[PDB]
Design a protein around this ligand. Structure first.
Ligand code: CA
Length: 186
């Protein structure tokens, strides 16, 4: 048994709207935009399932469907608005959200602006040492699929594109040697 921490940055590539007229979802303590763990997870899971419910998907993301309750190896935090974004956007006078009319019948839609970065954390639970590499390959695949799709609303009109970067993998509990694990971007 071991826990492996995967951390890095999610960068908004096109305006991101994940909702709670239509405000974006926020961290209740800071009032800043947040990318909920369940949004990231839901898309990774769906995209990976669609790529191959399939045991490689299930053991990674779990299932609460009737008769087959398997626990998730992979836990996905909320991704929080980074300090670096705060400092950079503040100094250079860049908007971190903005509100547009949709495409008094138009809805008013807020989005997180491109260049906004969020710190993310995934925790991987080593329930089976022999499966870690295949699992990390599948996590990598899921991230790639997510980068070629979108999060949130307005996806099919171009919104919600994101990019993962500056990822780091550390064994935080246990002796599993994770130094050879790597999430290859693109
Ligand atoms: Ca490492």
């Amino acid at each position: 048994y071991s826990k492996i921490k995967i951390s890095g940055t999610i960068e908004v590539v096109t305006g991101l709207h994940i909702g709670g007229d239509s405000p974006v979802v926020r961290d209740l303590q800071t009032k800043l935009p947040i990318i909920p763990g369940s949004s990231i997870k839901g898309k990774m899971r769906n995209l990976l399932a669609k790529h191959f419910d399939d045991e490689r998907v299930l053991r990674l993301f779990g299932s609460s469907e009737k008769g087959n309750i398997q626990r998730a190896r992979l836990q996905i935090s909320d991704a929080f608005f980074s300090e670096k974004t705060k400092e950079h956007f503040a100094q250079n006078d860049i908007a971190y959200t903005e509100t547009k009319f949709e495409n008094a019948n138009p809805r008013q839609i807020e989005r997180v602006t491109r260049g906004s970065e969020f710190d993310f954390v995934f925790i991987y639970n080593v329930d089976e040492e022999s499966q870690v590499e295949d699992d990390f390959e599948n996590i990598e695949k899921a991230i790639h699929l997510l980068e070629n799709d979108y999060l949130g609303g307005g996806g099919t009109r171009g919104n919600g594109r994101i990019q993962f970067k500056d990822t780091n993998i550390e064994t935080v509990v246990g002796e599993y040697d994770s130094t050879n694990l790597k999430i290859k971007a693109a």
